[PDB]
Amino acid sequence: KVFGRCELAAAMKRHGLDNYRGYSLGNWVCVAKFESNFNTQATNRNTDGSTDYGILQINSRWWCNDGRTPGSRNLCNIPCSALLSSDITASVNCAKKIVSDGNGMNAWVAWRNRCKGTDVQAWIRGCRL
Ligand SMILES: [Cl-]
Ligand SMILES: [Cl-]
Ligand SMILES: [Cl-]
Ligand SMILES: [Cl-]
Ligand SMILES: [Cl-]
Ligand code: NA
């Protein structure tokens, strides 16, 4: 599923991401845009052989099980395929654990390089929220 911008903002708010660990909603919409173009089915292979899954591009090196990332962890206790669902619940719940792991949203390289220090509120402007 490719979400619309305000459709994604609404789902992220309903699932409790607005101000989660101090990160306003626009930060989460911004990172989703640059990670996946709002596409729940997005996947990308990393150089080490791990893979990033779903709208928030969550990495199998640490967070989910895909059966083909030797030595990795599954800290969110989910199959990576659950992160590709049209419903974002699993991605949101796992993002809450990632952002709580000490580095905040710097866990997403794209957030640090493309969202951090910008006007992230623009990503939720106009949305009925
Ligand atoms: Cl957009
Ligand atoms: Cl915001
Ligand atoms: Cl594995
Ligand atoms: Cl959803
Ligand atoms: Cl933080
Ligand atoms: Na894993």
**Domain coordinates in residue numbering, the chain:** 5-124
Collapse the DSSP code of 121 into the 3-class scheme (helix H, G, I; strand E, B; otherwise coil) and give the result.
helix
Check whether 101 is labelled as a binding-site residue: yes
Centre of ligand 1 to C-alpha 32, Å, is: 10
**Alpha helices (runs of H) in the chain, residue ranges in sequence order:** 5-14, 25-36, 89-99, 109-114
DSSP state of 44: E
Cα–Cα distances in Å, from 77 out to 2, 64, 66, 92, 116? Answer: 25, 6, 11, 13, 29
Compute, in angstroms, the gap from residue 74 CA to the centroid of ligand 1: 31
Catalytic residue flag (residue 7): no
Residue type, 14: R
Centre of ligand 5 from the C-alpha of residue 42, in Å: 26
Technique used: X-ray
Distance, C-alpha 124 to centroid of its chain: 16
CATH code reported for the domain at 5-124: 1.10.530.10
**What is d(CA 111, CA 47) in angstroms, rounded to the nearest whole number?**
19
